[PDB]
Enzyme design. Structure first.
Site, PDB file in Angstrom:
ATOM      1  N   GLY A 109       0.784  -1.330  -0.022  1.00 62.22           N
ATOM      2  CA  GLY A 109      -0.142  -0.027  -0.221  1.00 62.22           C
ATOM      3  C   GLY A 109       0.814   1.368   0.015  1.00 62.22           C
TER       4      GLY A 109
ATOM      5  N   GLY B 243       3.300   2.052  -2.361  1.00 59.53           N
ATOM      6  CA  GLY B 243       3.025   2.827  -3.857  1.00 59.53           C
ATOM      7  C   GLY B 243       4.234   2.166  -4.767  1.00 59.53           C
ATOM      8  N   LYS B 244       4.609   0.853  -4.455  1.00 55.93           N
ATOM      9  CA  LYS B 244       5.467   0.042  -5.215  1.00 55.93           C
ATOM     10  C   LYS B 244       5.100  -0.171  -6.663  1.00 55.93           C
ATOM     11  CE  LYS B 244       6.040  -3.459  -2.516  1.00 55.93           C
ATOM     12  NZ  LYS B 244       5.134  -2.715  -1.771  1.00 55.93           N
ATOM     13  N   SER B 245       4.017  -0.756  -6.770  1.00 61.22           N
ATOM     14  CA  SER B 245       3.203  -0.829  -8.018  1.00 61.22           C
ATOM     15  C   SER B 245       2.863   0.486  -8.797  1.00 61.22           C
ATOM     16  CB  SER B 245       2.099  -1.834  -8.126  1.00 61.22           C
ATOM     17  OG  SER B 245       2.764  -2.929  -7.620  1.00 61.22           O
ATOM     18  N   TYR B 246       2.343   1.374  -8.106  1.00 59.68           N
ATOM     19  CA  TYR B 246       1.925   2.807  -8.657  1.00 59.68           C
ATOM     20  C   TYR B 246       3.298   3.396  -9.101  1.00 59.68           C
ATOM     21  CZ  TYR B 246       0.188   7.568  -8.931  1.00 59.68           C
ATOM     22  OH  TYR B 246      -0.039   8.699  -9.422  1.00 59.68           O
TER      23      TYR B 246
ATOM     24  N   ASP C 258       9.672  -5.021  -9.089  1.00 61.22           N
ATOM     25  CA  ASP C 258       8.456  -4.411  -8.008  1.00 61.22           C
ATOM     26  C   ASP C 258       8.350  -5.574  -7.144  1.00 61.22           C
ATOM     27  OD1 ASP C 258       4.809  -4.018  -8.733  1.00 61.22           O
ATOM     28  OD2 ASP C 258       6.193  -3.709  -6.790  1.00 61.22           O
TER      29      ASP C 258
ATOM     30  N   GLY D 165       5.390  -6.866  -0.659  1.00 58.91           N
ATOM     31  CA  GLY D 165       5.328  -6.086   0.613  1.00 58.91           C
ATOM     32  C   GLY D 165       6.481  -6.198   1.624  1.00 58.91           C
TER      33      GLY D 165
HETATM   34  N1  LIG Z   1       3.159   8.344  -5.097  1.00 59.71           N
HETATM   35  C1  LIG Z   1       1.484   8.194  -4.928  1.00 59.71           C
HETATM   36  N2  LIG Z   1       0.892   9.105  -5.315  1.00 59.71           N
HETATM   37  C2  LIG Z   1      -0.426   8.875  -5.238  1.00 59.71           C
HETATM   38  N3  LIG Z   1      -1.147   7.933  -4.882  1.00 59.71           N
HETATM   39  C3  LIG Z   1      -0.397   6.852  -4.833  1.00 59.71           C
HETATM   40  C4  LIG Z   1       1.079   7.039  -4.938  1.00 59.71           C
HETATM   41  N4  LIG Z   1       1.565   5.772  -4.563  1.00 59.71           N
HETATM   42  C5  LIG Z   1       0.608   5.004  -4.088  1.00 59.71           C
HETATM   43  N5  LIG Z   1      -0.641   5.802  -4.392  1.00 59.71           N
HETATM   44  C6  LIG Z   1      -1.783   5.239  -4.128  1.00 59.71           C
HETATM   45  O1  LIG Z   1      -1.755   4.012  -3.194  1.00 59.71           O
HETATM   46  C7  LIG Z   1      -2.536   2.760  -3.880  1.00 59.71           C
HETATM   47  C8  LIG Z   1      -1.858   1.631  -3.547  1.00 59.71           C
HETATM   48  O2  LIG Z   1      -0.437   1.739  -4.332  1.00 59.71           O
HETATM   49  P1  LIG Z   1       0.277   0.272  -4.776  1.00 59.71           P
HETATM   50  O3  LIG Z   1       1.269   0.546  -5.820  1.00 59.71           O
HETATM   51  O4  LIG Z   1      -0.598  -0.617  -5.155  1.00 59.71           O
HETATM   52  O5  LIG Z   1       0.906  -0.201  -3.357  1.00 59.71           O
HETATM   53  P2  LIG Z   1       1.976  -1.510  -3.435  1.00 59.71           P
HETATM   54  O6  LIG Z   1       3.462  -0.907  -2.658  1.00 59.71           O
HETATM   55  O7  LIG Z   1       2.405  -1.954  -4.716  1.00 59.71           O
HETATM   56  N6  LIG Z   1       1.071  -2.547  -2.509  1.00 59.71           N
HETATM   57  P3  LIG Z   1       1.563  -4.307  -2.436  1.00 59.71           P
HETATM   58  O8  LIG Z   1       1.604  -4.807  -4.082  1.00 59.71           O
HETATM   59  O9  LIG Z   1       0.361  -5.084  -1.631  1.00 59.71           O
HETATM   60  O10 LIG Z   1       2.621  -4.667  -1.670  1.00 59.71           O
HETATM   61  C9  LIG Z   1      -2.793   3.143  -5.338  1.00 59.71           C
HETATM   62  O11 LIG Z   1      -3.908   2.759  -5.650  1.00 59.71           O
HETATM   63  C10 LIG Z   1      -2.491   4.690  -5.535  1.00 59.71           C
HETATM   64  O12 LIG Z   1      -4.041   5.420  -5.481  1.00 59.71           O
HETATM   65 MG   LIG Z   2       2.127  -3.742  -5.630  1.00 60.13          MG
END
Ligand SMILES: Nc1ncnc2c1ncn2[C@@H]1O[C@H](COP(=O)(O)OP(=O)(O)NP(=O)(O)O)[C@@H](O)[C@H]1O
Ligand SMILES: [Mg+2]
Length: 333
Positions: A93, A95-98, A226, A229
């Site tokens: 959560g 932001g890794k995938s974002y 990527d 978690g």
């Molecule tokens: N830099 C950012 N700016 C704005 N929104 C962000 C940002 N990073 C993450 N988000 C928001 O956070 C949500 C979750 O991000 P996500 O990239 O899926 O986290 P993650 O690290 O990949 N989690 P996980 O795959 O379960 O280990 C996304 O739907 C975005 O809306």
């Molecule tokens: Mg992810």
């Protein structure tokens, strides 16, 4: 040179604003300030990325900012014949995938890298040079490697000259963004959480000396990683061993121990052996959530990011002798 480390603070989401979770992460220039819920801890990095809010305006700026600072450099690294790697690390959560892939409305590093790659090869190809592009896309779950562009699970081996590689992993030639976008889009649909994804581009740069007809290759590689978690025996092995690797290499980057770096204790750290301490130009993007409910995981991410920038890499240009001679002859003209 040293592993480059960026920290990206995602903005406060709606839940954190609605429920009055206190914001504990501040940024100033390339410094991250973690406040408590009992002294402010200040960490320093090469880059820090943050946003004022979640508006479209700020998100568009954020993705452009990350690409301007890390994406262009890694693209350039590949055109200079270096192995380059960006890996995103942090709590679920955060932001890794974002950051790595992004969304359709907010494209991340990989879509922009693939677009810039073909923009550049098609612009730069001429009588003196051509380019070949090959992509692989794989996932590490439960210490098993699955091929996302397709032999049910593949084995990691290491060749004395080739390095670690995934035996039998498909490597597909692509000639346009749309080819690669279609591949990454079907790889993206084949995922399985606590898994690690690796997107690998191989850029083969052939140089030609038109007078002689001699030719040579200079090979750049992009590893866009990527990770799973960071908050989380087989299923955690790769994540746990990466922590030890980063710690051990960080100690050596100063003068502590002299230090069992357990590269081959996991699939992930074995395939990333060159990316960390080896023949690569490497950047870490540490992603952190901003609010009080994650203070501890944030601190841990900030700390590994803090150690990672003491890691020393030794990147060389991967070119044959003809490529080096032909290239120098072209830089002189
Ligand atoms: N830099 C950012 N700016 C704005 N929104 C962000 C940002 N990073 C993450 N988000 C928001 O956070 C949500 C979750 O991000 P996500 O990239 O899926 O986290 P993650 O690290 O990949 N989690 P996980 O795959 O379960 O280990 C996304 O739907 C975005 O809306
Ligand atoms: Mg992810």
């Amino acid at each position: 040179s040293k592993v480059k480390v960026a920290v990206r603070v995602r903005p406060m989401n709606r839940r954190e604003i609605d429920l009055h979770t206190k914001c504990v992460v501040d940024v100033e220039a390339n410094k991250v300030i973690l406040n408590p819920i009992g002294q402010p801890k200040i960490f320093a990095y090469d880059h820090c990325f943050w946003s004022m809010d979640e508006s479209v305006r700020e998100k568009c700026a954020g993705q452009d900012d990350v690409f301007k600072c890390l994406g262009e450099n890694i693209l350039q690294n590949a055109f200079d014949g270096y192995n380059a790697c960006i890996f995103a690390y942090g709590q679920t959560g955060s932001g890794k995938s974002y950051t790595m892939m992004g969304t359709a409305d907010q494209p991340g590093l990989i879509p922009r890298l693939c677009s810039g790659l073909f923009e550049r090869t098609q612009k730069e190809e001429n009588e003196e040079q051509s380019f070949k592009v090959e992509v692989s896309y794989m996932e590490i779950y439960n210490e098993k490697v699955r091929d996302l562009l397709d032999r049910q699970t593949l084995k990691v081996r290491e060749h004395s000259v080739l390095g670690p590689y995934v035996d039998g992993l498909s490597k597909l030639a692509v000639t346009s963004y749309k080819d690669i976008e279609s591949l990454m889009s079907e790889g993206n649909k084949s995922r399985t959480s606590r898994s690690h994804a690796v997107f690998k581009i191989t850029l083969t740069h052939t140089l030609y000396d038109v007078k002689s007809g001699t030719s040579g290759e200079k090979v750049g590689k992009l590893s866009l990683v990527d990770l799973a978690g960071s908050e989380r025996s087989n299923i955690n092995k790769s994540l746990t061993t990466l922590g030890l690797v980063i710690s051990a290499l960080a100690d050596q980057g100063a003068g502590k121990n002299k230090k069992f770096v357990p590269y081959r204790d996991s699939v992930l750290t074995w395939l990333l052996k060159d990316s960390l301490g080896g023949n690569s130009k490497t950047a870490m993007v540490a992603t952190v959530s901003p609010a009080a409910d994650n203070y501890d995981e944030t601190l841990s991410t900030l700390r590994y990011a803090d150690r990672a920038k003491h890691i020393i890499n030794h990147a060389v240009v991967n070119e044959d002798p003809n490529a080096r001679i032909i290239r120098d002859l072209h830089h002189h003209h």
